Amino acid sequence: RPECFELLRVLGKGGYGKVFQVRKVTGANTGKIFAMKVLKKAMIVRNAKDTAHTKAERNILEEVKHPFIVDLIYAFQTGGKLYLILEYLSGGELFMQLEREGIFMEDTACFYLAEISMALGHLHQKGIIYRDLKPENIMLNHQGHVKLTDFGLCKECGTIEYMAPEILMRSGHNRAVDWWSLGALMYDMLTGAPPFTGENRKKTIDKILKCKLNLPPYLTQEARDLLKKLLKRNAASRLGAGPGDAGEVQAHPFFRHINWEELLARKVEPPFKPLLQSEEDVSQFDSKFTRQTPVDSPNQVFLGFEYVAPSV
Ligand SMILES: NC(=O)c1cccc2c(N[C@H](CN3CCC3)c3ccc(Cl)c(C(F)(F)F)c3)ncnc12
């Protein structure tokens, strides 16, 4: 429980609680740094979908161990709070790397999109959907591989720039939305901007719903092609929208230089290497958050929420 963890830093904040950087104190894994995520039970239980959703996240981070998905090392509770201990992803938000770098070289984008396309594959086999591939929602670990992290209540629910039309029309949707999203993510990577904007939210949607795609000349034919098959407004036919799913996608010429087995084993050199002078090094995050002093102010429905990662 809470006592074992010393709050080193604030890494993220929101309506529902906070994400803390903390070093464990007692027992082995003593000294080891983690990320602590704390939700107020208060704000979750007064809504229906919120509670199920928090619980889904709880059960998904357990059912799903996979190279490219934030792990759960402990989970537990108290009075009015919810605690998850995740590995601490010092690589920060893909969002940040994209700002620091401004734009990505193709084979740079290719490496991230590849790794990501594998977590969707994995996720889709457990009949799980990720919905949102904004760079904000994607993190890097210490060695700089990708980590999908957001499976629960979101951090507020943010920009819509990376949402397929079927979600924005609420017409009903499936695992296909992810491939639309992946395309939008890709396009942004290669051009420095989401495929649709967007004086404002209202107009952005109109674009995402109505406008023709815009493929700059400096885009290689394969990339021009992926973007087009992935940003398909008709879902039935959006690449990846078939029984083969992730497979249909990974098998596009864009990904011809990818060794899926080495990639999965984290043996492909990440295009960028988090610069860490230490385990707790946070110079990859945003001193907007890291500056602040880390404080944890003090018939439930969250049964056997507690959790402990098997060996270790
Ligand atoms: N594991 C880490 O090292 C680590 C380090 C920093 C942030 C996160 C994080 N933050 C997500 C936001 N995701 C990160 C990209 C978009 C998040 C989700 C729900 C909530 Cl309520 C919050 C909170 F408001 F801060 F509590 C944050 N989620 C998971 N691990 C993190």
Count other C-beta atoms under 10 Å from residue 294's C-beta: 17
Q: How far apart are CA 7 and CA 179, in angstroms?
A: 38
Burial class (CB in 10 A: 0-12, 13-18, 19+), 30: exposed
Ramachandran angles phi, psi of 57, nearest 5°: -60, -45
- Chain center to CA of 48: 24
C-beta separation of 12 from 18 below 8 A: yes
The number of the ligand 1 atom at minimal distance from the alpha carbon of 13 is 25
- State the DSSP code for 284: T
User: CATH: 1.10.510.10, 1.10.10.10, 3.40.718.10, 3.10.400.10. Which one for 92-265?
Assistant: 1.10.510.10
Query: Which two structure tokens, joined as six digits, stand for 106?
Result: 């193709």
Question: Which residues are near ligand 1 (CB < 6 Å)?
Answer: 11-14, 16-19, 35, 37, 39, 70, 86, 88-89, 93, 136-137, 139, 149-150, 155
Report helix, strand or coil for 72.
Answer: strand
Distance 146 CA to ligand 1 centre (A): 14
Q: Which of 34, 94, 149 to mutate to test the pocket of ligand 1 (most atoms within 8 A of CB)?
A: 149
Method: X-ray
Ramachandran angles phi, psi of 188, nearest 5°: -65, -50
Q: Which of 39, 155, 283 to mutate to test the pocket of ligand 1 (most atoms within 8 A of CB)?
A: 155
Long-range contacts at 245-252 (CB < 8 A, ≥ 24 apart): 245/120, 245/121, 245/124, 245/175, 246/117, 246/118, 246/120, 246/121, 246/124, 247/121, 249/117, 249/179, 249/182, 250/114, 250/117, 250/118, 250/121, 252/222, 252/225, 252/226
- What stretches of the chain show up as alpha helix (H) in DSSP? 41-45, 48-63, 94-101, 106-125, 165-168, 177-191, 201-210, 221-230, 246-250, 260-264, 287-290
Q: How far apart are CA 209 and CA 234, in angstroms?
A: 11
Query: Over the Cα atoms of the chain, what is R_g?
Result: 20
The number of the ligand 1 atom at minimal distance from the alpha carbon of 17 is 26
C-beta separation of 114 from 189 below 8 A: no
Q: CB within 8 A of 95, min separation 6: which ones?
A: 134, 135, 136, 138
Burial class (CB in 10 A: 0-12, 13-18, 19+), 164: buried
Residue whose token pair is 């002078």: 277
